[PDB]
């Protein structure tokens, strides 16, 4: 029972069309069948890294209790075509924001049906139960608006918007660029 | 500014100008054959000036100089570029398959 935003959705796709080339992560925060209210991406190429991660983890934790959020989910997109299943560093990224919330379940952005419009759910959700993660049902509907991500997110990368993207390491590059992104949202408002 | 360079030109052309009044004022000792030895103020003064003003165009003309220390042109260049390796590109990526093939 996982549930995110068609926000979510869009910022997935920007953040893949981001860095075709490059495996990305980021998280999903949520307030306290979890919908993920809002996303924010941290990363790209290289993900093994543990002090960047931990850095990262704890400005997501207190950008979201100061706004009340919490965070309640954990994306990934592999760089490999042919790979979907999750590396040792999505995993344990998962088990330990897993570890505040049960709700928290993992995500990850399967590059191989990233197309232009995102004609079926990319995003492939892992729940942790039995110790181990493993998939639910792709049958099962990701996004609240699918035909509204759809168009959404076919809208912004024929905008060109995934190239004014900021994730977390831009923010790392230089603070001035706003990691908190809210260029995409007001994009979304107004493609919406 | 590029205009520099327009005004070396110039600078040349005044010299060349007083090498023609110098060759002119040399006919005119070889003409006059008197005891002067002395080329006429005004035509050493334009030479000097021509000197003078080609130089200081030289100068901005030679260029800007570059630091020593090797840190400066890499403070810019962030971990984005370097990790590239162009000569290990990998095509195996969702680049190929999110864009028109």
């Given at each position: 029972?996982?549930?995110?935003?068609?926000?979510?959705?869009?910022?997935?796709?920007?953040?893949?069309?981001?860095?075709?080339?490059?495996?990305?992560?980021?998280?999903?925060?949520?307030?306290?069948?979890?919908?993920?209210?809002?996303?924010?991406?941290?990363?790209?190429?290289?993900?093994?890294?543990?002090?960047?991660?931990?850095?990262?983890?704890?400005?997501?934790?207190?950008?979201?209790?100061?706004?009340?959020?919490?965070?309640?989910?954990?994306?990934?997109?592999?760089?490999?075509?042919?790979?979907?299943?999750?590396?040792?560093?999505?995993?344990?990224?998962?088990?330990?924001?897993?570890?505040?919330?049960?709700?928290?379940?993992?995500?990850?952005?399967?590059?191989?049906?990233?197309?232009?419009?995102?004609?079926?759910?990319?995003?492939?959700?892992?729940?942790?139960?039995?110790?181990?993660?493993?998939?639910?049902?792709?049958?099962?509907?990701?996004?609240?608006?699918?035909?509204?991500?759809?168009?959404?997110?076919?809208?912004?990368?024929d905008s060109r918007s995934y190239?004014?993207?900021?994730?977390?390491?831009?923010?790392?590059?230089?603070?001035?660029?706003?990691?908190?992104?809210?260029?995409?949202?007001?994009?979304?408002?107004?493609?919406? | 500014?590029?205009?520099?360079?327009?005004?070396?030109?110039?600078?040349?052309?005044?010299?060349?100008?007083?090498?023609?009044?110098?060759?002119?004022?040399?006919?005119?000792?070889?003409?006059?054959?008197?005891?002067?030895?002395?080329?006429?103020?005004?035509?050493?003064?334009?030479?000097?000036?021509?000197?003078?003003?080609?130089?200081?165009?030289?100068?901005?003309?030679?260029?800007?100089?570059?630091?020593?220390?090797?840190?400066?042109?890499?403070?810019?260049?962030?971990?984005?570029?370097?990790?590239?390796?162009?000569?290990?590109?990998?095509?195996?990526?969702?680049?190929?398959?999110?864009?028109?093939?």
């Amino acid at each position: 029972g996982v549930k995110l935003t068609t926000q979510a959705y869009c910022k997935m796709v920007l953040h893949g069309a981001k860095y075709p080339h490059c495996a990305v992560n980021g998280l999903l925060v949520a307030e306290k069948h979890t919908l993920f209210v809002d996303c924010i991406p941290l990363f790209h190429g290289t993900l093994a890294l543990a002090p960047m991660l931990e850095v990262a983890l704890t400005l997501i934790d207190s950008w979201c209790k100061d706004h009340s959020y919490v965070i309640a989910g954990y994306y990934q997109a592999n760089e490999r075509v042919k790979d979907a299943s999750p590396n040792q560093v999505a995993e344990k990224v998962a088990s330990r924001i897993a570890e505040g919330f049960s709700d928290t379940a993992l995500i990850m952005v399967d590059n191989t049906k990233f197309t232009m419009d995102c004609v079926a759910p990319t995003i492939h959700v892992y729940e942790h139960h039995e110790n181990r993660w493993r998939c639910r049902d792709p049958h099962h509907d990701y996004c609240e608006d699918w035909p509204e991500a759809q168009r959404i997110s076919a809208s912004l990368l024929d905008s060109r918007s995934y190239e004014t993207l900021v994730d977390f390491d831009n923010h790392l590059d230089d603070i001035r660029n706003d990691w908190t992104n809210p260029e995409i949202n007001k994009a979304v408002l107004h493609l919406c | 500014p590029s205009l520099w360079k327009g005004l070396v030109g110039i600078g040349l052309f005044a010299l060349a100008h007083a090498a023609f009044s110098a060759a002119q004022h040399r006919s005119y000792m070889r003409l006059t054959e008197k005891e002067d030895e002395s080329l006429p103020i005004d035509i050493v003064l334009q030479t000097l000036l021509a000197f003078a003003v080609t130089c200081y165009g030289i100068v901005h003309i030679a260029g800007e100089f570059k630091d020593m220390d090797a840190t400066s042109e890499l403070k810019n260049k962030t971990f984005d570029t370097l990790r590239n390796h162009p000569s290990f590109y990998v095509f195996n990526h969702r680049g190929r398959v999110l864009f028109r093939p």
